[PDB]
């Protein structure tokens, strides 16, 4: 049950300097990269082309190449239409793709943010502002929705091309997506004890402190933090009085361990 995300960030510093950079995710694994410096989209996995033929990929990459240049000039030209109302620096973010369900089911999305705030989406057959958006965006939306060719193209990207492509990615990337990597844990203190868990994949993990068979409810989980090799890191802390560190252990459950949990005693 996986989500495909194309994330774009564009910074326009003044009227003659900008950059656009993208990365693509399938779940929590990176499948593509496209920096401003590169003319082409880079694969970050062997299976990033999915089940597309080479001609299909070239044609699709070509469209994005046109988009990136056209996108840049359109923002610049929209800023001229609003001014002096809005002004550089401007940051635009896009989050697009689709979530994939069993059967033949999927929802596609295309959300746009302006200065860190979600203001616009593509929905149905047109662009629209969302609740909370400044009403001045109605002029840009009216201008964007005049472009019928962009509309037809985006509809086909979201309704058809995206789910197709992702169904092919899941088949081709099945082995990386279903990999199992073991967590290795270790203890430390500052009283605050700390149970470090690192190297595991996928993301779901259970980590608690234990005096024998009694889950210390004072255990605080931190955020899931990434490692460079596409595995995860997490730490569970427990607050305690000096002298009463005797008997405490850290238990870690994870799908890669196949039943035999890790238990480290202090």
């Amino acid at each position, epitope marked *: 049950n996986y989500t495909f995300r194309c994330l774009q960030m564009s910074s326009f510093a003044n009227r003659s300097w900008s950059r656009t950079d993208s990365v693509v995710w399938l779940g929590d694994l990176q499948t593509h990269r496209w920096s401003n410096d590169s003319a082409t989209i880079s694969f970050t996995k062997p299976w990033s082309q999915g089940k597309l033929s080479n001609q299909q990929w070239e044609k699709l990459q070509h469209m994005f190449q046109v988009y990136r*240049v*056209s996108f840049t000039r359109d923002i610049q030209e929209l800023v001229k239409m609003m001014s002096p109302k809005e002004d550089y620096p401007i940051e635009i973010q896009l989050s697009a793709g689709c979530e994939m369900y069993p059967g033949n089911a999927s929802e596609s999305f295309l959300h746009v943010a302006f200065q860190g705030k979600y203001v616009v989406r593509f929905w149905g057959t047109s662009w629209q502002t969302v609740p909370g958006a400044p009403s001045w965006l109605d002029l840009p939306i009216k201008v964007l929705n005049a472009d*019928q060719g962009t509309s037809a193209t985006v509809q086909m990207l979201l309704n058809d091309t995206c789910p197709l492509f992702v169904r092919g990615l899941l088949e081709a990337g099945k082995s990386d997506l279903e990999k199992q990597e073991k967590p290795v844990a270790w203890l430390s203190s500052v009283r605050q004890l700390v149970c470090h868990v690192s190297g595991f994949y996928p993301k779901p993990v259970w980590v608690m402190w234990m005096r024998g068979d009694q889950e210390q409810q004072g255990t605080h989980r931190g955020d899931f933090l990434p490692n460079a090799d596409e595995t995860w890191y997490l730490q569970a802390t427990l607050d305690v009085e000096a002298g009463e560190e005797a008997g405490l252990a850290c238990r870690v459950k994870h799908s890669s361990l196949g039943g035999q949990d890790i238990i480290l005693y202090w």
Partner: T-cell receptor
Amino acid sequence: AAVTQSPRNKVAVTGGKVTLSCNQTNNHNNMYWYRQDTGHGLRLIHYSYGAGSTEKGDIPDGYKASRPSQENFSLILELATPSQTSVYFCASGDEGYTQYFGPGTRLLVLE
Amino acid sequence: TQVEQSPQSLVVRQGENCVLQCNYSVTPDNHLRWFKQDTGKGLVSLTVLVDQKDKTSNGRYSATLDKDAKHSTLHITATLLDDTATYICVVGDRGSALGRLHFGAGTQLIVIP
């Protein structure tokens, strides 16, 4: 959707001030000034997205622009030169791609 | 220049057909418009083409566009003396007012009556 230009024809001396006005009653936000010289296509000088806006086009040098109102877009040649001898076209449009053209304005600039 | 027109000029006798070429490098290519311009006069739109492979007509004018090739032609059937004019090819790079128009330098047609 009609657009008018004035003057329709004009003779001027080097160093003089020439103003070419374009008027448009379609309530079009957007207006455009072009010059047509032989053996080139029309080239964009200035344009405007609304009252108070003026933007530089491809060949703005020697030309100032003025959008005092939604109706009038003016092209101001402050110090006219012979190289500004040409036929000038104005156009207007809303959010769609169509630019509706005026009938043109012939300018000769003599020494 | 991103829009090229052929021939530069041509002369035909009344009643004859002629074909006018337009080739372009503009990207992207939303639509292509053909204008007619009489000596000392305005731009009259003849037709506008918008599809990947497109065909239009307007009485004795017909036209084609192939966006893959980046090629348009304008056919004029049974020319009349009034067809004496410069014919201009224009490519608009957007489906909205965000676009720029790229103008060919025209083909001069003379019809001998």
